[PDB]
Amino acid sequence: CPRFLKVKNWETEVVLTDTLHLKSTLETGCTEYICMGSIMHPRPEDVATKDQLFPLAKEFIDQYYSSIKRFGSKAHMERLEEVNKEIDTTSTYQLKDTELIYGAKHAWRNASRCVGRIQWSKLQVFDARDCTTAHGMFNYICNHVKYATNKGNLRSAITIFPQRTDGKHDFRVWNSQLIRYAGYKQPDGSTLGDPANVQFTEICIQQGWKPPRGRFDVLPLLLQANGNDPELFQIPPELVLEVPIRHPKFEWFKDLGLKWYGLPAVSNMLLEIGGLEFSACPFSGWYMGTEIGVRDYCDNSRYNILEEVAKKMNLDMRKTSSLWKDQALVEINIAVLYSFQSDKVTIVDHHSATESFIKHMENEYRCRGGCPADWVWIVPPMSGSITPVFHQEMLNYRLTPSFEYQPDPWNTHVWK
Amino acid sequence: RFLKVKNWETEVVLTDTLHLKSTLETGCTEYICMGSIMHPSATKDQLFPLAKEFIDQYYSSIKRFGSKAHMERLEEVNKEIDTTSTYQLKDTELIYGAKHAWRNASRCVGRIQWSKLQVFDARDCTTAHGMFNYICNHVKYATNKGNLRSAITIFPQRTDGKHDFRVWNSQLIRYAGYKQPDGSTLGDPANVQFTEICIQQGWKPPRGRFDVLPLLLQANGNDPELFQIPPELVLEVPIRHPKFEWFKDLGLKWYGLPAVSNMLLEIGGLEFSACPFSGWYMGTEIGVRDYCDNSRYNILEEVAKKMNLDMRKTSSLWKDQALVEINIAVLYSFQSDKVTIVDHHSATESFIKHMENEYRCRGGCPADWVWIVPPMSGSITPVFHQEMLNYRLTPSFEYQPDPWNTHVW
Ligand code: HEM
Numbered sequence: 001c002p003r004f005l006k007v008k009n010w011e012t013e014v015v016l017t018d019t020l021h022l023k024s025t026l027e028t029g030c031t032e033y034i035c036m037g038s039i040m041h042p043r044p045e046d047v048a049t050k051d052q053l054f055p056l057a058k059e060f061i062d063q064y065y066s067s068i069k070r071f072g073s074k075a076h077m078e079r080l081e082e083v084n085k086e087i088d089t090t091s092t093y094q095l096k097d098t099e100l101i102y103g104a105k106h107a108w109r110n111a112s113r114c115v116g117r118i119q120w121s122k123l124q125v126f127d128a129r130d131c132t133t134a135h136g137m138f139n140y141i142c143n144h145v146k147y148a149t150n151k152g153n154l155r156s157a158i159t160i161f162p163q164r165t166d167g168k169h170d171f172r173v174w175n176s177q178l179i180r181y182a183g184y185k186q187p188d189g190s191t192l193g194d195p196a197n198v199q200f201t202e203i204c205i206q207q208g209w210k211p212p213r214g215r216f217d218v219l220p221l222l223l224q225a226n227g228n229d230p231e232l233f234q235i236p237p238e239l240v241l242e243v244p245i246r247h248p249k250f251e252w253f254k255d256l257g258l259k260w261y262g263l264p265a266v267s268n269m270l271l272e273i274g275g276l277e278f279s280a281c282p283f284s285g286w287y288m289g290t291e292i293g294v295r296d297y298c299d300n301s302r303y304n305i306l307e308e309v310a311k312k313m314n315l316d317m318r319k320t321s322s323l324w325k326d327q328a329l330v331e332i333n334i335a336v337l338y339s340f341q342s343d344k345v346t347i348v349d350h351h352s353a354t355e356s357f358i359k360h361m362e363n364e365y366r367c368r369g370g371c372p373a374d375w376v377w378i379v380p381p382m383s384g385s386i387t388p389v390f391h392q393e394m395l396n397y398r399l400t401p402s403f404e405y406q407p408d409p410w411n412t413h414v415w416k
Numbered sequence: 417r418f419l420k421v422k423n424w425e426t427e428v429v430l431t432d433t434l435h436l437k438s439t440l441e442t443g444c445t446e447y448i449c450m451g452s453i454m455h456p457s458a459t460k461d462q463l464f465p466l467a468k469e470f471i472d473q474y475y476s477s478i479k480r481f482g483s484k485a486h487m488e489r490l491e492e493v494n495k496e497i498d499t500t501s502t503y504q505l506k507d508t509e510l511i512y513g514a515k516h517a518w519r520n521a522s523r524c525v526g527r528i529q530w531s532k533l534q535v536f537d538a539r540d541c542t543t544a545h546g547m548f549n550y551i552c553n554h555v556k557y558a559t560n561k562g563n564l565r566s567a568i569t570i571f572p573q574r575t576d577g578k579h580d581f582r583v584w585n586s587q588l589i590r591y592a593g594y595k596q597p598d599g600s601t602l603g604d605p606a607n608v609q610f611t612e613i614c615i616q617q618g619w620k621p622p623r624g625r626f627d628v629l630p631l632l633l634q635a636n637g638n639d640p641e642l643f644q645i646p647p648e649l650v651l652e653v654p655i656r657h658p659k660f661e662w663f664k665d666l667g668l669k670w671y672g673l674p675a676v677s678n679m680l681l682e683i684g685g686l687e688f689s690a691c692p693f694s695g696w697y698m699g700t701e702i703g704v705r706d707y708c709d710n711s712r713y714n715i716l717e718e719v720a721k722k723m724n725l726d727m728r729k730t731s732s733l734w735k736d737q738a739l740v741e742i743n744i745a746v747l748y749s750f751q752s753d754k755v756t757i758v759d760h761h762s763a764t765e766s767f768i769k770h771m772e773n774e775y776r777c778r779g780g781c782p783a784d785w786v787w788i789v790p791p792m793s794g795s796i797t798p799v800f801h802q803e804m805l806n807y808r809l810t811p812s813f814e815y816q817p818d819p820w821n822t823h824v825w
């Protein structure tokens with residue numbers, strides 16, 4: 001591999017030079033002969049061995065002491081030595097609070113699929129490594145939700161539960177996101193609520209949940225501590241800020257009865273710091289409008305409202321070339337942004353977000369030597385080429401610390 | 417290893433085996449993906465294997481692999497490669513190689529049509545006057561009074577690199593662009609430089625907003641020569657809108673024939689540096705990129721002005737609203753004039769069907785998601801949800817240098 005890789009912006013002619021890729025740590029899925037850039041996802045007891053762990057820890061500790069301008073210092077060498085002994089005698093080690101915060105912020109900084117990374121240094125890290133029970137997980141998660149929501153002035157935050165040990169004692173949030181709406185399959189094949197969540201809803205019901213069977217039912221939390229069977233908790237509904245969707249011009253848009261929650265909070269990913277694996281690490285930011293207006297509402301296998309919206313707009317739906325779908329899509333996203341702003345809930349439109357990401361990427365090239373980015377995810381799902389990231393060449397590679405996918409827990413859990 | 421691709425909307429899973437047959441590199445590595453990079457980075461010795469591989473798959477495609485005709489064709493080609501440092505393709509081979517270059521073009525959403533390609537053999541051309549005649553015939557055939565027909569015209573192959581045939585125009589039909597004294601740009605800003613090369617070469621510019629550029633044609637490595645396409649061959653569509661009466665007053669028009677003329681066609685190790693090819697438009701090519709790119713005609717501000725939209729904040733989505741209207745106007749206008757055009761919903765739907773066909777009959781379909789997904793309304797087209805594997809099969813279309821950067825005058 002060469003030391004210097006160039007990327008061009010085809011709209012502005014700006015060229016940037018990447019050296020950070022020399023620190024990439026593992027596989028994209030691509031090869032010399034095949035590109036897997038559009039592929040979404042390219043044993044329990046299989047935990048890191050002592051010989052695997054030493055280099056991953058040293059690499060992270062080295063990186064940490066470089067960041068605080070103490071590389072090679074006495075504190076750096078003593079931390080290296082203490083980590084070595086801890087791995088040598090316990091087969092693992094514990095991060096200092098400073099290292100945990102640094103590692104979590106850098107996993108976000110390194111997330112090539114995230115357009116919101118200009119905020120990466122401003123992340124509230126909640127250390128929940130003392131947690132031992134699912135009730136305690138629930139407490140921790142409620143405090144996160146209340147802190148992050150902040151009455152509509154949203155604040156990015158992560159909560160980190162105890163790391164994996166032998167793989168039989170994992171902490172997991174079984175929910176894929178902290179706040180999601182239930183989905184219910186009817187005997188006639190139709191779905192009520194969010195069709196994407198039918199499987200997880202059936203698990204919850206089997207576990208004891210009494211479903212209201214409405215269109216927008218907040219799912220309960222399903223929380224697994226120390227490898228035990230997961231337990232159900234209802235999030236207090238006063239902690240779940242929601243927005244009813246209305247339109248600045250179409251009086252009838254409120255009659256659709258749409259709403260959405262304020263807080264996007266991912267809870268199914270794994271945080272990897274210095275070889276350590278944090279299998280429960282819920283993190284949250286705030287929404288870009290297209291996540292709701294295009295994907296949640298207009299994906300065919302989600303709420304799928306395009307038809308009903310186009311009918312109330314009195315569009316010609318007989319041909320595709322009238323672009324009735326595109327017309328209705330824009331009006332739906334106008335209503336989502338207008339609703340969040342009217343209720344003073346943080347939200348960013350896709351123009352502002354992508355423009356901020358270009359500024360962030362240019363600063364990272366200048367100050368850090370690069371910025372890994374997944375164009376397929378960064379470009380928004382509508383109006384792609386009228387945002388600046390469409391025209392921006394990007395390089396994608398995997399730096400650590402990192403957020404990683406992990407198996408769904410109901411597939412791997414051994415029931416007690 | 418076999419590779420699976422999933423559609424996340426339909427849950428359809430396809431199995432790719434065809435990638436095991438590629439050799440040309442993608443630019444990616446195990447550590448770095450270059451999927452969004454637009455331009456990632458012969459002799460008798462290297463020529464015979466490529467030639468052999470191509471003849472091999474040709475006779476394989478006609479169910480006569482290892483036949484007598486096939487063996488003696490390989491002898492014929494080897495005999496020719498050492499005694500002349502090259503070889504010539506049979507007509508049947510040229511046609512098959514051109515069709516499969518289109519079939520293998522990862523970035524083209526239009527490939528369901530790949531086997532209906534009219535192939536014009538111009539390998540006997542020797543002068544730029546001949547190139548002009550061949551190109552006029554192509555334009556007339558492909559335009560067909562608005563019932564557009566896919567076509568390619570193939571000029572003589574590269575020999576020593578000093579006698580290249582080149583069409584200096586990036587496309588056969590483009591509008592000129594002019595740098596203005598105050599600093600603005602009239603016409604198409606992407607062609608300001610190419611327009612200057614034409615003006616410098618003697619072209620008398622009308623200095624309008626939609627001036628059809630002349631052909632700049634280079635034969636056998638000589639200086640390029642200017643030619644005017646007879647205007648009755650250049651089909652244009654005035655853009656108007658089904659609802660907005662004022663849209664016609666924007667003065668917008670476009671041409672009906674998209675024809676790429678700056679690419680290189682590689683077949684069996686031979687390099688055809690002049691090979692203009694043409695299809696019909698997807699509406700977004702004009703209404704999104706040509707009209708609404710900030711570096712192109714850049715008309716969003718004007719349209720949203722006539723639409724009386726609030727343009728003070730981004731979150732009004734005034735740009736997205738005006739964008740959809742412009743693209744409605746394009747589709748309505750071509751359709752009203754009976755000029756072939758495909759909307760991005762129909763085009764992407766056909767491409768999924770084409771993917772299904774290719775996995776069934778061929779074991780795969782190389783596809784560049786970055787280029788296949790349309791530049792507007794991405795996730796409400798089915799390709800957004802389709803995983804695609806990208807890999808480089810030959811015969812292929814490739815990029816080549818701009819002629820004004822290599823030419824010794
Ligand atoms: C602060 C405001 C934020 C904004 C506006 C934002 C924006 C986005 C968007 C629009 C996506 C695409 C989501 C999808 O298509 O499903 C995304 C993905 C992602 N974000 Fe951010 N994000 C923010 C905060 C955060 C934070 C705080 C973290 C971690 C600490 C984070 C890590 C990620 C990751 C790992 C992904 C990829 C998720 C996946 O692969 O499914 N983001 N972000």
Ligand code: HEM
Binds near residue numbers: 525696
């Ligand atoms: C017949 C109807 C066709 C349609 C609707 C169609 C559609 C498209 C579109 C929308 C693009 C993207 C262009 C851009 O963004 O600049 C494209 C690219 C391309 N097309 Fe097709 N196309 C058609 C015919 C053809 C033909 C006849 C050929 C060759 C014989 C061909 C070869 C290619 C190639 C090589 C590219 C990539 C160009 C590049 O890399 O810049 N296409 N096509």
Ligand SMILES: Cc1cc(N)nc(CCc2cc(CCCN(C)C)c(F)c(F)c2F)c1
Binds near residue numbers: 177263266283291
């Ligand atoms: C920190 C953060 C900020 C932000 N702005 N957004 C997200 C993403 C949240 C999210 C993502 C999805 C996608 C599911 C997986 N995809 C691949 C199908 C949802 F469904 C969902 F409800 C949901 F809240 C996370």
Ligand SMILES: Cc1cc(N)nc(CCc2cc(CCCN(C)C)c(F)c(F)c2F)c1
Binds near residue numbers: 587673697701
């Ligand atoms: C066979 C074919 C069918 C189709 N439907 N479309 C095309 C593309 C043609 C084209 C492409 C561009 C893009 C220029 C290069 N890009 C990277 C900036 C033009 F500008 C242009 F005028 C133009 F006709 C080709």
Ligand SMILES: C[C@H](O)[C@H](O)[C@H]1CNc2nc(N)[nH]c(=O)c2N1
Binds near residue numbers: 038803
């Ligand atoms: C097949 C394709 O990779 C898939 O549909 C991707 C495309 N880009 C995306 N981009 C974002 N931000 N989120 C997604 O879920 C997807 N889905």
Ligand SMILES: C[C@H](O)[C@H](O)[C@H]1CNc2nc(N)[nH]c(=O)c2N1
Binds near residue numbers: 010
């Ligand atoms: C940087 C990026 O590769 C570039 O802007 C691409 C993105 N996708 C595209 N897709 C098509 N069809 N045409 C293009 O010109 C581009 N441009």
Ligand SMILES: [Zn+2]
Binds near residue numbers: 035444448
């Ligand atoms: Zn790749």
